[PDB]
Amino acid sequence: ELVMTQSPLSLPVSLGDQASISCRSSQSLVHSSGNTYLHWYLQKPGQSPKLLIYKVSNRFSGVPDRFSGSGSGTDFTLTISRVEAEDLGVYYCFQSSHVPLTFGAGTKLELKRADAAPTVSIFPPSSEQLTSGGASVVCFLNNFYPKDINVKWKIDGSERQNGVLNSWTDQDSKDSTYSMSSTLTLTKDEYERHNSYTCEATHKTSTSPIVKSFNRN
Amino acid sequence: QLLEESGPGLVQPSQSLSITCTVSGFSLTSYGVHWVRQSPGKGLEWLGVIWSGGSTDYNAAFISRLSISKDNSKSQVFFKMNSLQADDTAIYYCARNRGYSYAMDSWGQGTSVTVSSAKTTPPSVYPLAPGSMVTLGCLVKGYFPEPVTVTWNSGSLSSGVHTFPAVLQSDLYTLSSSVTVPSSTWPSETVTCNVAHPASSTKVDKKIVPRD
């Protein structure tokens, strides 16, 4: 098949920096017509993708000259000479030289900021939910950076991976941090069967993990 | 140039999805129209296209259940996909082929499709109180379909709020939201989780109070 590999997956930048995003195809994108149908799109949250560069290096209508595309055959690069806030989003390369037409997996252009440790809060099941016959233990890991983070749940000192559901927010608009929510789902009998519940967060801001616990008592 | 998808929103698995793309500002006899979808699990995927000339091209992985046609005089393109499965849940777009560049240039706003056998179900809203700043929460569990809107103190408390994307569990959605306020404001001052689920016409105002 014709695979499009976009690199990098995430690209943290400071406003003003230059950014370079690459796209490599498993086969030459030079089409039999002699044209190279490699294009670049930028997509923002809640919006459809917008065309930036078509046929390797042609800037599309209304696209600022800071954007430029280059490359040939199987290697392509999109360059933003001086990054602006409005450039933040996910970039996708798209090839229409071979059917099926395919998109790269996208590169997220994100804003860098100082590293920040997560504020971790753990919550036992509400009595309301307990009455209903269920049990969810919730843990929030708020305002951290970078987004890479590892959350582990421990029940009576034993690590639990099944029954865990995680959700992550997008980079925050005001402080540029990320937040995450993790929920350990259990049967009420299971929950009542154990006493110590722990939410453990491992982030690069510390050699030591942040631990939050409670005892059902 | 303007493309607009008109679709069903909710579809049950095994059934079919029909979407009509109505275009304005240009002639279908002059520009081909592509269909592309987007889901978290598969990113952007091109489904097929109907060229100005009227011929079609499809992504081999869908051709067995996909059909695209158009009515040049009505400026409408018809998309129909059968035997939907849960992972066909996505945002479906039609986009204009920019002639000889073979790149999509004008896109429709997209129509969100959820493939699910689930029935409309209001959420269970559980307050999350602790077991300087204090973080309080709210668990909105077991609802369908998306979306629900969570606010704090009826929208009066907007800073320090994190509402997380819902996740699917047992075919129902569950999401949480956290708010962080100075500890000198809670519980001295009331903090409430406000949830609205349009589809089931329900709203829930859950006050967050200390435990035990």
Which residue in the block uniquely carries the two structure tokens 């499009």? A4
Nearest to B57 by CA among B27, B97, B109, B116: B97
Q: Which among B60, B131, B133 has CB closest to A100?
A: B60
Indicate whether B69 and B29 sit together in one domain. Answer: yes
- The pairing of strands A89-95 and A102-103 is antiparallel
Cα separations in angstroms, B87 against B40, B90, B113, B158: 10, 8, 10, 34
Which residue in the block uniquely carries the two structure tokens 């014709």? A2
Contacts of residue B71, defined as CB under 8 A and 6 or more positions apart, other chains included, come to: B78
CA distance linking residue A42 with residue A78, whole number of Å: 11
- The pairing of strands A4-7 and A164-168 is unpaired
Indicate whether B102 and B4 sit together in one domain. Answer: yes
Indicate whether B3 and B26 sit together in one domain. Answer: yes
CB atoms within 10 A of CB B117: 11
Parent domain of B166: 118-210
Instruction: Answer with the one of A66, A90, A113 that is the final residue of a domain.
Output: A113
Helices and strands in chain A: count of H runs, count of E runs: 2, 19
Nearest to A4 by CA among A29, A26, A28, A20: A26
Q: Which of residues 12-51 of A touch B (CB under 8 A)?
A: 35, 37, 39, 48-51
Indicate whether B21 and B82 sit together in one domain. Answer: yes
Indicate whether B94 and B127 sit together in one domain. Answer: no
Instruction: Answer with the one of B117, B133, B156 that is the final residue of a domain.
Output: B117
How was this structure obtained? Answer: X-ray
**Does residue A166 belong to the interface with chain B, where contact is any CB pair within 8 Å?**
yes
DSSP letter (8 states) at residue B151? E
Judge whether B177 and B137 are in contact, CB under 8 Å.
Answer: yes
List the CATH number of the domain containing B155.
2.60.40.10
CA distance linking residue A182 with residue A28, whole number of Å: 43
Contacts of residue B21, defined as CB under 8 A and 6 or more positions apart, other chains included, come to: B3, B4, B5, B6, B33, B35, B76, B77, B78, B79, B94, B108
Cα separations in angstroms, B156 against B137, B181, B191, B192: 16, 13, 10, 10
Record: contact A138-B139, CB cut-off 8 A: yes
For residue A100, cis peptide bond before it (omega within 30 degrees of 0): yes
Indicate whether B19 and B109 sit together in one domain. Answer: yes
CB atoms within 10 A of CB A73: 13
Q: Using an 8 Å CB-CB cutoff, list chain A residues near B104.
A: 49, 51, 94
Record the tokens describing residue A79, joined without a space: 């360059």
- The pairing of strands B10-11 and B111-115 is parallel
Record the tokens describing residue A53, joined without a space: 């560069």
Interface contacts A/B by beta carbons within 8 Å: 134
- Picking from B37, B102, B180 by the largest number of A CB atoms within 10 A of its own CB, the best residue to mutate is B102
CA distance linking residue A125 with residue A30, whole number of Å: 58
**Does residue B13 belong to the interface with chain A, where contact is any CB pair within 8 Å?**
no
Own/partner contacts of B156-163, CB < 8 Å, gap of 24 or more, are B157/B181, B157/B191, B160/B133, B162/A140, B162/A142, B162/A169, B162/A179, B162/A181, B163/A169
Indicate whether A68 and A95 sit together in one domain. Answer: yes
CA distance linking residue B126 with residue B129, whole number of Å: 10
CA distance linking residue B186 with residue B196, whole number of Å: 23
Residue environment code for B91-108, b if the CB has 16+ CB neighbours within 10 A, otherwise e? bbbbbbbbeebbbbbbbb
Tally of domains within chain B: 2
Judge whether B178 and A140 are in contact, CB under 8 Å.
Answer: yes
CA distance linking residue A39 with residue A51, whole number of Å: 8
β-pair partners for A50: A42
Judge whether B98 and A55 are in contact, CB under 8 Å.
Answer: no
Instruction: Answer with the one of A113, A141, A169 that is the final residue of a domain.
Output: A113
Indicate whether A81 and A18 sit together in one domain. Answer: yes
Indicate whether A55 and A127 sit together in one domain. Answer: no
CA distance linking residue A176 with residue A171, whole number of Å: 5
